[PDB]
Design a binder for these strands. Structure first.
Lengths: 117, 117
RNA sequence: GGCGAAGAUCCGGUGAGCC
RNA sequence: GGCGAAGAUCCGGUGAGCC
């Protein structure tokens, strides 16, 4: 298939909880273009990438480059569900964490749960 | 009426007739943005401004900003007449000549006819 | 109520085509 | 037939509002 990572529901939902309570403290990028070029700036602390993208063309590129710049990234759920997580009113194929707010020291834990594959 | 130098009709028609036969003879920029950059870059030797343009604004800036950069300019009644004269298929509020093609002597005499009203 | 991060609006550049 | 130098298309920035 498109993205080559598999991930249980519980930690995907951990991604939506972290992304749901990051906005009040840090910064987040919404949408695949802002994610791709915000990370291409080198400013990603954790990337959101989803497989329910149609056509797969939409994001079939960013996990690989997020492995190059060695920025964390996680395959998560439905575009809609993350859309609610980042708190915009529309589906979202890809997101990013740009500033860690007052929470900071969980994002590392999540990156190493990503390193499991 | 932003006509700050009232130009005769016969002189308008001679200017548009001259402007008719200089589009593979010389080079002309079409449209208020291309005319205004023609004056700003500094490569316009004679710009045409139509006076029935509405809103006036759309080209109202170009005679004064044109005079300051000391590029001559001449006034024309209908935007339509100018637009069809400069062989494009739509009305045109403002035009410019940036290269005089082979017509150095006629445009020279006409420029001196402008500087005088 | 419809459209919208599968990118709304706006801006810059480009300059004669697009349906 | 319609739209178009009162800027078609295309490219750029911006990132959440527009009817």
């Amino acid at each position: 298939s498109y993205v080559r990572f598999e991930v249980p529901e519980d930690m995907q939902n951990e991604a939506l909880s972290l992304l749901e309570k990051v906005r009040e403290s840090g910064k987040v990028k919404k949408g695949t273009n802002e994610t791709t070029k915000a990370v291409e700036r080198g400013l990603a602390k954790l990337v959101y990438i989803a497989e329910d993208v149609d056509p797969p063309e939409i994001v079939a590129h960013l996990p690989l480059l997020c492995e190059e710049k060695n920025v964390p990234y996680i395959y998560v759920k439905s575009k809609n569900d993350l859309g609610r997580a980042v708190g915009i009113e529309v589906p979202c194929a890809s997101a990013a964490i740009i500033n860690e707010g007052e929470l900071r020291k969980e994002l590392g834990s999540l990156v190493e749960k990503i390193k499991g594959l």
